[PDB]
Short mmCIF file of C-alpha atoms and ligand atoms in Angstrom, two decimals:
data_model
loop_
_atom_site.label_atom_id
_atom_site.label_comp_id
_atom_site.label_asym_id
_atom_site.label_seq_id
_atom_site.Cartn_x
_atom_site.Cartn_y
_atom_site.Cartn_z
CA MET A 1 -95.94 33.02 4.17
CA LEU A 2 -95.67 29.55 5.71
CA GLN A 3 -93.77 28.43 2.59
CA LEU A 4 -91.18 29.03 5.28
CA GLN A 5 -92.31 25.75 6.88
CA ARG A 6 -91.91 23.68 3.68
CA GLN A 7 -88.14 24.12 3.85
CA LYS A 8 -87.91 23.53 7.62
CA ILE A 9 -88.40 19.87 6.77
CA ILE A 10 -86.47 19.87 3.49
CA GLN A 11 -83.41 20.90 5.46
CA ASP A 12 -84.23 18.08 7.86
CA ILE A 13 -84.66 15.56 5.03
CA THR A 14 -81.40 16.60 3.41
CA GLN A 15 -79.76 16.63 6.85
CA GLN A 16 -80.60 12.95 7.36
CA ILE A 17 -79.61 11.83 3.86
CA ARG A 18 -76.23 13.51 4.30
CA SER A 19 -75.95 12.34 7.92
CA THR A 20 -76.54 8.65 7.34
CA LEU A 21 -74.67 8.51 4.01
CA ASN A 22 -71.30 9.85 5.21
CA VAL A 23 -68.91 7.24 6.61
CA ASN A 24 -67.53 9.26 9.52
CA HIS A 25 -70.94 9.77 11.11
CA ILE A 26 -71.33 6.03 11.59
CA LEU A 27 -67.69 5.47 12.41
CA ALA A 28 -68.11 8.16 15.05
CA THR A 29 -71.26 6.60 16.49
CA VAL A 30 -69.99 3.02 16.57
CA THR A 31 -66.83 4.02 18.45
CA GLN A 32 -68.85 6.12 20.89
CA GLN A 33 -70.73 2.86 21.58
CA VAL A 34 -67.78 0.48 21.62
CA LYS A 35 -66.35 2.89 24.20
CA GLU A 36 -69.42 3.13 26.42
CA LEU A 37 -69.98 -0.65 26.10
CA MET A 38 -66.51 -2.04 26.88
CA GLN A 39 -65.78 0.65 29.52
CA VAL A 40 -62.51 1.45 27.81
CA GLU A 41 -60.70 4.75 28.13
CA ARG A 42 -60.15 5.20 24.36
CA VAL A 43 -61.50 3.78 21.09
CA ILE A 44 -59.70 4.64 17.87
CA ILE A 45 -60.10 3.77 14.19
CA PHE A 46 -56.55 3.63 12.85
CA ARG A 47 -56.91 3.98 9.10
CA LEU A 48 -54.27 2.60 6.74
CA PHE A 49 -53.78 4.15 3.26
CA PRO A 50 -52.02 2.05 0.59
CA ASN A 51 -49.36 4.69 -0.19
CA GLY A 52 -47.98 3.89 3.27
CA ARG A 53 -49.69 6.63 5.24
CA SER A 54 -51.90 5.86 8.22
CA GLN A 55 -53.92 7.93 10.65
CA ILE A 56 -56.25 7.73 13.63
CA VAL A 57 -59.32 9.04 11.80
CA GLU A 58 -61.91 8.72 14.59
CA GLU A 59 -61.42 8.50 18.33
CA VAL A 60 -63.42 8.65 21.53
CA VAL A 61 -61.20 9.46 24.51
CA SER A 62 -62.22 9.75 28.08
CA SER A 63 -61.41 13.41 28.79
CA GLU A 64 -58.52 12.24 31.03
CA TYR A 65 -56.11 11.23 28.22
CA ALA A 66 -54.77 12.76 25.05
CA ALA A 67 -56.60 13.21 21.79
CA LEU A 68 -54.64 10.91 19.56
CA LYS A 69 -57.15 11.92 16.89
CA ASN A 70 -55.58 12.63 13.51
CA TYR A 71 -52.40 10.97 14.80
CA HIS A 72 -50.67 9.73 11.74
CA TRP A 73 -47.56 8.36 10.04
CA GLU A 74 -46.22 7.55 6.54
CA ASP A 75 -44.70 4.35 5.07
CA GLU A 76 -46.26 2.17 7.77
CA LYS A 77 -44.68 -1.30 7.86
CA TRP A 78 -46.23 -3.95 10.10
CA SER A 79 -44.53 -7.17 11.07
CA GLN A 80 -45.51 -9.86 8.60
CA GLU A 81 -46.32 -12.35 11.40
CA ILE A 82 -48.96 -9.81 12.49
CA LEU A 83 -50.72 -9.03 9.21
CA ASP A 84 -51.22 -12.76 8.68
CA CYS A 85 -53.07 -12.82 12.00
CA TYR A 86 -54.99 -9.72 10.83
CA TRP A 87 -55.90 -10.80 7.30
CA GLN A 88 -57.40 -13.93 8.77
CA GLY A 89 -59.87 -11.59 10.46
CA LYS A 90 -58.48 -12.39 13.91
CA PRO A 91 -58.37 -9.64 16.55
CA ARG A 92 -55.16 -9.25 18.56
CA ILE A 93 -55.13 -9.10 22.35
CA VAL A 94 -52.24 -7.04 23.67
CA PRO A 95 -52.49 -7.53 27.45
CA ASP A 96 -49.29 -5.52 28.03
CA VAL A 97 -48.75 -2.92 25.28
CA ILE A 98 -45.59 -1.88 27.07
CA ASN A 99 -43.68 -5.15 26.53
CA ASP A 100 -45.37 -5.92 23.20
CA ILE A 101 -42.44 -6.52 20.88
CA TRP A 102 -44.63 -5.87 17.81
CA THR A 103 -45.52 -2.37 19.09
CA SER A 104 -42.00 -1.73 20.42
CA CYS A 105 -41.81 1.38 18.27
CA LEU A 106 -45.07 3.05 19.33
CA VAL A 107 -43.51 4.04 22.63
CA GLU A 108 -44.01 7.71 21.95
CA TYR A 109 -47.56 6.96 20.91
CA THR A 110 -48.04 4.53 23.78
CA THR A 111 -46.94 6.86 26.56
CA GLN A 112 -48.90 9.92 25.42
CA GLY A 113 -51.97 7.78 24.84
CA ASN A 114 -51.04 6.19 28.18
CA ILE A 115 -52.12 2.74 26.92
CA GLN A 116 -51.68 -0.19 29.27
CA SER A 117 -53.43 -3.01 27.38
CA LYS A 118 -55.52 -3.10 24.22
CA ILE A 119 -57.52 -5.18 21.75
CA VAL A 120 -56.77 -4.61 18.04
CA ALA A 121 -59.47 -5.61 15.52
CA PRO A 122 -58.85 -5.66 11.74
CA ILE A 123 -61.30 -4.00 9.38
CA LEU A 124 -61.10 -5.96 6.16
CA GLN A 125 -62.27 -5.43 2.59
CA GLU A 126 -63.04 -8.13 0.07
CA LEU A 127 -61.38 -6.20 -2.75
CA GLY A 128 -61.31 -8.41 -5.82
CA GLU A 129 -60.51 -7.38 -9.39
CA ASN A 130 -57.59 -4.88 -9.59
CA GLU A 131 -55.97 -2.96 -6.73
CA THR A 132 -52.57 -3.50 -5.12
CA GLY A 133 -50.82 -1.74 -2.27
CA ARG A 134 -49.18 -2.22 1.11
CA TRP A 135 -52.16 -3.63 3.06
CA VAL A 136 -53.47 -6.20 0.59
CA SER A 137 -53.40 -10.01 0.56
CA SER A 138 -53.50 -12.43 -2.34
CA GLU A 139 -53.61 -15.52 -0.12
CA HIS A 140 -56.78 -14.19 1.56
CA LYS A 141 -58.23 -12.08 -1.32
CA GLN A 142 -58.67 -9.28 1.22
CA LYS A 143 -57.46 -5.75 1.98
CA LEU A 144 -56.84 -4.24 5.43
CA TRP A 145 -58.61 -0.88 5.41
CA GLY A 146 -57.78 0.02 8.99
CA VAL A 147 -58.06 -1.26 12.56
CA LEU A 148 -60.59 -0.74 15.36
CA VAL A 149 -58.57 -0.49 18.60
CA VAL A 150 -59.70 -0.28 22.20
CA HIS A 151 -57.30 1.11 24.87
CA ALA A 152 -57.18 0.12 28.51
CA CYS A 153 -55.34 3.15 29.90
CA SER A 154 -56.28 3.31 33.59
CA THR A 155 -55.18 -0.26 34.33
CA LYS A 156 -53.39 -3.11 32.63
CA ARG A 157 -56.68 -4.76 31.80
CA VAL A 158 -57.10 -8.46 31.14
CA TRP A 159 -59.34 -9.29 28.21
CA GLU A 160 -61.71 -12.23 27.87
CA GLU A 161 -61.77 -13.93 24.47
CA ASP A 162 -65.39 -12.86 24.15
CA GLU A 163 -64.27 -9.24 24.51
CA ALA A 164 -61.95 -9.54 21.50
CA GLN A 165 -64.50 -11.83 19.80
CA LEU A 166 -67.03 -9.04 20.26
CA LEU A 167 -64.87 -6.15 19.11
CA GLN A 168 -64.08 -8.19 16.02
CA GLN A 169 -67.78 -8.72 15.42
CA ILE A 170 -68.24 -4.95 15.48
CA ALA A 171 -65.18 -4.41 13.30
CA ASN A 172 -66.51 -6.90 10.76
CA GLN A 173 -69.73 -4.87 10.75
CA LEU A 174 -67.91 -1.64 9.93
CA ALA A 175 -66.14 -3.43 7.07
CA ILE A 176 -69.51 -3.87 5.38
CA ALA A 177 -70.54 -0.29 6.14
CA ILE A 178 -67.36 1.12 4.63
CA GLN A 179 -67.28 -0.94 1.42
CA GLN A 180 -70.53 0.77 0.46
CA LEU A 181 -69.64 4.40 1.23
CA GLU A 182 -66.43 5.08 -0.75
CA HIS A 183 -67.90 6.81 -3.87
CA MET B 1 -73.66 -13.80 33.47
CA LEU B 2 -74.11 -10.24 32.23
CA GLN B 3 -72.14 -11.19 29.10
CA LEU B 4 -75.80 -11.22 28.13
CA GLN B 5 -75.67 -7.39 28.16
CA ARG B 6 -72.65 -7.17 25.82
CA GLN B 7 -74.75 -8.50 22.95
CA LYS B 8 -77.82 -6.39 23.78
CA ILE B 9 -75.87 -3.51 22.26
CA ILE B 10 -74.10 -5.50 19.55
CA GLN B 11 -77.51 -6.34 18.15
CA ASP B 12 -78.32 -2.64 18.38
CA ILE B 13 -75.08 -1.64 16.66
CA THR B 14 -75.61 -4.14 13.87
CA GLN B 15 -79.26 -3.08 13.69
CA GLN B 16 -78.27 0.51 12.93
CA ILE B 17 -75.54 -0.36 10.41
CA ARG B 18 -78.01 -2.53 8.51
CA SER B 19 -80.83 0.00 8.99
CA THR B 20 -79.05 3.05 7.64
CA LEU B 21 -77.17 1.17 4.90
CA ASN B 22 -80.18 -0.36 3.12
CA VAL B 23 -81.79 1.83 0.45
CA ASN B 24 -85.42 1.03 1.19
CA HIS B 25 -85.21 2.23 4.79
CA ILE B 26 -84.39 5.74 3.61
CA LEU B 27 -86.69 5.58 0.63
CA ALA B 28 -89.42 4.58 3.07
CA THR B 29 -88.65 7.41 5.47
CA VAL B 30 -88.35 10.16 2.85
CA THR B 31 -91.72 9.27 1.32
CA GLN B 32 -93.33 9.12 4.77
CA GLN B 33 -92.09 12.72 5.11
CA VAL B 34 -92.91 13.96 1.61
CA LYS B 35 -96.40 12.66 2.38
CA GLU B 36 -96.81 14.28 5.79
CA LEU B 37 -95.24 17.52 4.46
CA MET B 38 -97.19 18.09 1.24
CA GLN B 39 -100.47 16.77 2.73
CA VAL B 40 -100.88 14.44 -0.21
CA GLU B 41 -102.93 11.26 -0.13
CA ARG B 42 -100.20 9.05 -1.67
CA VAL B 43 -96.44 9.18 -2.30
CA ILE B 44 -94.89 6.52 -4.50
CA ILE B 45 -91.41 5.74 -5.81
CA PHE B 46 -91.99 4.29 -9.27
CA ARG B 47 -88.81 2.42 -10.09
CA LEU B 48 -87.76 1.82 -13.70
CA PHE B 49 -85.54 -1.18 -14.60
CA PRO B 50 -83.61 -1.06 -17.90
CA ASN B 51 -84.99 -4.39 -19.20
CA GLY B 52 -88.30 -2.55 -19.52
CA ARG B 53 -89.86 -3.54 -16.21
CA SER B 54 -91.04 -0.95 -13.71
CA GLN B 55 -92.63 -1.08 -10.29
CA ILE B 56 -93.91 1.06 -7.43
CA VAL B 57 -91.25 -0.03 -4.93
CA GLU B 58 -92.22 2.19 -1.98
CA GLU B 59 -95.49 3.91 -1.21
CA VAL B 60 -97.21 5.76 1.61
CA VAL B 61 -100.98 5.78 1.15
CA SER B 62 -103.52 7.40 3.33
CA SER B 63 -105.52 4.38 4.53
CA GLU B 64 -108.46 5.57 2.38
CA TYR B 65 -107.03 4.52 -1.02
CA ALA B 66 -105.48 1.44 -2.53
CA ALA B 67 -102.01 0.10 -1.93
CA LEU B 68 -100.48 0.54 -5.33
CA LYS B 69 -97.32 -0.82 -3.72
CA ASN B 70 -95.49 -3.36 -5.85
CA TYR B 71 -97.65 -2.24 -8.78
CA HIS B 72 -95.62 -3.02 -11.81
CA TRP B 73 -95.35 -3.46 -15.57
CA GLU B 74 -92.88 -4.70 -18.23
CA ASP B 75 -91.53 -3.04 -21.42
CA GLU B 76 -92.41 0.45 -20.18
CA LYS B 77 -92.30 3.01 -23.00
CA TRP B 78 -92.67 6.68 -22.13
CA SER B 79 -93.42 9.40 -24.64
CA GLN B 80 -90.15 10.87 -25.86
CA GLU B 81 -91.39 14.45 -25.34
CA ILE B 82 -91.70 13.50 -21.65
CA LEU B 83 -88.34 11.86 -20.97
CA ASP B 84 -86.63 14.94 -22.39
CA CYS B 85 -88.47 16.98 -19.75
CA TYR B 86 -87.42 14.34 -17.19
CA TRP B 87 -83.75 13.94 -18.12
CA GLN B 88 -83.37 17.68 -17.77
CA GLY B 89 -84.20 17.11 -14.10
CA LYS B 90 -87.53 18.95 -14.43
CA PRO B 91 -90.52 17.74 -12.40
CA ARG B 92 -93.86 17.43 -14.21
CA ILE B 93 -97.06 18.98 -12.87
CA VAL B 94 -100.13 17.01 -13.91
CA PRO B 95 -103.00 19.18 -12.62
CA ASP B 96 -105.59 16.85 -14.18
CA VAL B 97 -104.30 13.25 -14.41
CA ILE B 98 -107.61 12.30 -15.96
CA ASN B 99 -107.19 14.32 -19.18
CA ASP B 100 -103.40 13.96 -19.25
CA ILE B 101 -102.74 12.63 -22.74
CA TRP B 102 -99.31 11.31 -21.68
CA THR B 103 -100.89 9.14 -18.95
CA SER B 104 -103.90 8.22 -21.13
CA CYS B 105 -103.06 4.56 -20.64
CA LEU B 106 -102.80 4.51 -16.83
CA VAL B 107 -106.57 4.71 -16.56
CA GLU B 108 -106.77 1.41 -14.75
CA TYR B 109 -103.97 2.56 -12.49
CA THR B 110 -105.44 6.04 -12.20
CA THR B 111 -108.93 4.99 -11.13
CA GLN B 112 -107.87 2.41 -8.53
CA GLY B 113 -105.30 4.82 -7.14
CA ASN B 114 -108.08 7.41 -7.48
CA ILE B 115 -105.57 10.09 -8.55
CA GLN B 116 -106.92 13.51 -9.41
CA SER B 117 -103.73 15.55 -9.87
CA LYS B 118 -100.07 14.80 -9.24
CA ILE B 119 -96.47 16.02 -9.35
CA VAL B 120 -93.92 13.68 -10.99
CA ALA B 121 -90.23 14.15 -10.05
CA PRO B 122 -87.40 12.35 -11.88
CA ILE B 123 -84.70 10.56 -9.91
CA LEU B 124 -81.59 10.74 -12.04
CA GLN B 125 -78.21 9.02 -12.05
CA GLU B 126 -75.00 10.42 -13.47
CA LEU B 127 -74.00 7.06 -14.95
CA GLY B 128 -70.89 7.56 -17.04
CA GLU B 129 -68.61 4.87 -18.46
CA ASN B 130 -70.55 1.84 -19.84
CA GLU B 131 -74.24 1.04 -19.35
CA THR B 132 -77.08 1.28 -21.86
CA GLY B 133 -80.78 0.57 -21.56
CA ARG B 134 -84.25 2.03 -21.98
CA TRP B 135 -84.03 4.91 -19.47
CA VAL B 136 -80.64 6.37 -20.37
CA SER B 137 -79.60 9.58 -22.13
CA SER B 138 -76.48 10.38 -24.11
CA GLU B 139 -77.42 14.04 -24.64
CA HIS B 140 -77.63 14.53 -20.84
CA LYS B 141 -75.11 11.84 -19.69
CA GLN B 142 -77.77 10.70 -17.22
CA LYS B 143 -79.96 7.70 -16.39
CA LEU B 144 -83.54 7.78 -15.06
CA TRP B 145 -83.59 5.40 -12.10
CA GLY B 146 -87.20 5.98 -11.17
CA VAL B 147 -89.66 8.74 -10.29
CA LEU B 148 -90.90 10.24 -7.02
CA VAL B 149 -94.63 10.91 -7.48
CA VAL B 150 -97.13 12.65 -5.22
CA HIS B 151 -100.89 11.98 -5.67
CA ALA B 152 -103.70 14.41 -4.98
CA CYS B 153 -106.58 11.94 -4.68
CA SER B 154 -109.22 13.71 -2.57
CA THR B 155 -109.39 16.78 -4.82
CA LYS B 156 -108.07 17.96 -8.15
CA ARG B 157 -105.32 19.90 -6.44
CA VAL B 158 -103.55 22.88 -7.96
CA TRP B 159 -99.80 22.90 -7.47
CA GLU B 160 -97.56 25.90 -6.94
CA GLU B 161 -94.24 25.86 -8.80
CA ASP B 162 -92.50 25.80 -5.43
CA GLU B 163 -94.35 22.57 -4.63
CA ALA B 164 -92.91 20.85 -7.71
CA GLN B 165 -89.62 22.74 -7.19
CA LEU B 166 -89.53 21.26 -3.70
CA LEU B 167 -90.43 17.69 -4.59
CA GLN B 168 -87.70 17.84 -7.21
CA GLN B 169 -85.25 19.05 -4.58
CA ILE B 170 -86.11 15.99 -2.51
CA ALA B 171 -85.95 13.71 -5.54
CA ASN B 172 -82.51 15.07 -6.42
CA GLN B 173 -81.48 14.22 -2.85
CA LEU B 174 -82.58 10.61 -3.20
CA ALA B 175 -80.59 10.38 -6.44
CA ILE B 176 -77.42 10.92 -4.42
CA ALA B 177 -78.52 8.49 -1.71
CA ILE B 178 -79.22 5.74 -4.23
CA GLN B 179 -76.03 6.05 -6.31
CA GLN B 180 -74.11 5.05 -3.18
CA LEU B 181 -76.19 2.06 -2.04
CA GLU B 182 -76.30 -0.28 -5.07
CA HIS B 183 -73.47 -2.74 -4.15
C1 CYC C 201 -42.63 -0.79 14.91
C2 CYC C 201 -42.15 -2.24 15.06
C3 CYC C 201 -43.58 -0.64 13.72
C4 CYC C 201 -45.11 -0.63 13.77
C5 CYC C 201 -45.84 -1.27 14.71
C6 CYC C 201 -47.18 -1.19 14.66
N1 CYC C 201 -47.88 -0.06 14.63
C7 CYC C 201 -49.17 -0.42 14.58
C8 CYC C 201 -50.24 0.41 14.57
C9 CYC C 201 -50.03 1.73 14.67
N2 CYC C 201 -49.04 2.47 14.14
C10 CYC C 201 -49.26 3.73 14.56
C11 CYC C 201 -48.58 4.86 14.28
C12 CYC C 201 -47.25 4.84 14.18
N3 CYC C 201 -46.52 3.92 13.53
C13 CYC C 201 -45.24 4.28 13.66
O1 CYC C 201 -44.19 3.57 13.13
C14 CYC C 201 -45.20 5.41 14.35
C15 CYC C 201 -44.09 6.06 14.69
C16 CYC C 201 -43.23 5.29 15.69
C17 CYC C 201 -46.43 5.77 14.68
C18 CYC C 201 -46.80 7.01 15.50
C19 CYC C 201 -50.36 3.76 15.29
C20 CYC C 201 -50.97 5.00 15.94
C21 CYC C 201 -50.83 2.54 15.36
C22 CYC C 201 -52.09 2.20 16.16
C23 CYC C 201 -51.64 1.78 17.54
C24 CYC C 201 -52.85 1.54 18.42
O2 CYC C 201 -52.85 0.58 19.21
O3 CYC C 201 -53.75 2.38 18.32
C25 CYC C 201 -49.26 -1.75 14.67
C26 CYC C 201 -50.63 -2.48 14.61
C27 CYC C 201 -51.54 -2.62 15.85
C28 CYC C 201 -51.01 -3.48 16.99
O4 CYC C 201 -50.95 -2.95 18.12
O5 CYC C 201 -50.80 -4.68 16.73
C29 CYC C 201 -48.01 -2.22 14.69
C30 CYC C 201 -47.58 -3.68 14.74
N4 CYC C 201 -45.60 0.07 12.73
C31 CYC C 201 -44.61 0.57 11.97
O6 CYC C 201 -44.79 1.25 10.96
C32 CYC C 201 -43.23 0.19 12.50
C33 CYC C 201 -42.16 -0.27 11.54
C1 CYC C 202 -99.27 5.15 -22.07
C2 CYC C 202 -99.24 6.32 -23.06
C3 CYC C 202 -97.86 4.75 -21.62
C4 CYC C 202 -97.16 5.19 -20.33
C5 CYC C 202 -97.42 6.35 -19.69
C6 CYC C 202 -96.74 6.63 -18.56
N1 CYC C 202 -96.68 5.84 -17.49
C7 CYC C 202 -95.91 6.48 -16.60
C8 CYC C 202 -95.61 6.06 -15.35
C9 CYC C 202 -96.16 4.93 -14.90
N2 CYC C 202 -96.41 3.78 -15.57
C10 CYC C 202 -96.99 2.95 -14.69
C11 CYC C 202 -97.41 1.69 -14.84
C12 CYC C 202 -97.97 1.29 -15.99
N3 CYC C 202 -97.53 1.58 -17.22
C13 CYC C 202 -98.36 0.98 -18.08
O1 CYC C 202 -98.23 1.06 -19.44
C14 CYC C 202 -99.27 0.32 -17.37
C15 CYC C 202 -100.26 -0.39 -17.88
C16 CYC C 202 -101.30 0.48 -18.60
C17 CYC C 202 -99.03 0.50 -16.08
C18 CYC C 202 -99.87 -0.10 -14.94
C19 CYC C 202 -97.07 3.56 -13.52
C20 CYC C 202 -97.65 2.96 -12.23
C21 CYC C 202 -96.56 4.77 -13.64
C22 CYC C 202 -96.51 5.75 -12.48
C23 CYC C 202 -97.77 6.60 -12.57
C24 CYC C 202 -97.84 7.53 -11.37
O2 CYC C 202 -98.22 8.70 -11.53
O3 CYC C 202 -97.54 7.02 -10.28
C25 CYC C 202 -95.58 7.68 -17.08
C26 CYC C 202 -94.66 8.66 -16.29
C27 CYC C 202 -95.20 9.57 -15.18
C28 CYC C 202 -96.17 10.67 -15.61
O4 CYC C 202 -97.28 10.70 -15.05
O5 CYC C 202 -95.73 11.52 -16.41
C29 CYC C 202 -96.07 7.75 -18.32
C30 CYC C 202 -95.93 8.90 -19.31
N4 CYC C 202 -96.26 4.27 -19.97
C31 CYC C 202 -96.25 3.22 -20.82
O6 CYC C 202 -95.51 2.24 -20.72
C32 CYC C 202 -97.26 3.40 -21.95
C33 CYC C 202 -96.86 3.07 -23.38
#
């Protein structure tokens, strides 16, 4: 009978509960908006895992440049002078990725991605109590889950402070979204 | 300048993160769908707190009958024979709320709400580790967060098993949504 129609909404209802409740769906929609908003050729979420590993877990590329999605690496060491900047919740404006001495090893990554300038925006976690790893601060009582990055690839773009300011605002909004959705 | 327009999306982006991430927004949208789907005059989420208190925290009434929203009570004791049924994850079909001996005290509540029949659907929580209260089972390793109820008010409605079956499916979907969103 039309008991058929009862489930045509139950599958909807479940579909939304699962949709909204999974982290990637809202990661994937924020980045698709950061991209269309800042008119930037690529938006990635570089995720850092405390064992050392790290991976671009979401990405929104203009079709012109490579899918750095899933791009990854193990035992990721960042320059101390840079994590300080990042634990303080401060974005990082890299107006010339090419001569950026802190990213002087992501030359492979830089040239395939074809990145000219970029803004890097920490995603932080107030993780109190007990957890220790590679991306964690005791001075700041905060953990660095990953990084929202935005890639100027077509031109060496110059960034206004409000651009970084803004990306950081959005990053700091993900931070809250992610702390909830980790099971 | 048009730096104005940068924030007209940031307020959107934040608006969605906050929207999706707060429990009530998805409680309120499920019930508005359970209601429009089962053609039932009222849909409530009766929430049970372990101190004893309990309250109708969301509701979707047809404009014809009272807002039992926020309707509440303290030191709520349910008949043991009934929690067993509920911890097992089994909905309860009450085809005549009026002569339901287990709800023989919600006569005030029944007559204002004007409830003729109803389906009652437990919302359960696999709460392991350490927490004990009034709504918690050791036999079933499960806690009873609240109850999704559906109220036939216009007529003493008869319910097909699939109707209860279905409401329970939806209840069991909330259970997963709520376990995530408690901070
Ligand atoms: C070189 C000095 C070291 C380093 C720099 C560094 N990397 C990031 C962020 C990223 N790291 C990667 C991935 C890689 N790390 C690697 O060491 C390698 C192999 C060479 C790879 C492929 C990626 C993809 C990023 C994100 C880059 C992006 O802009 O999307 C940073 C932080 C961000 C910044 O630009 O400030 C830094 C400083 N990381 C190391 O592990 C090296 C010892
Ligand atoms: C009487 C035997 C006892 C009781 C029955 C009972 N209540 C519910 C669920 C609800 N309880 C309330 C609120 C009240 N509980 C009260 O004791 C009072 C005062 C009389 C109120 C106002 C509400 C609103 C509900 C939800 C009812 C609904 O259908 O929306 C149940 C569970 C659900 C069912 O119908 O099986 C039961 C068995 N609760 C008690 O605390 C009494 C000792």
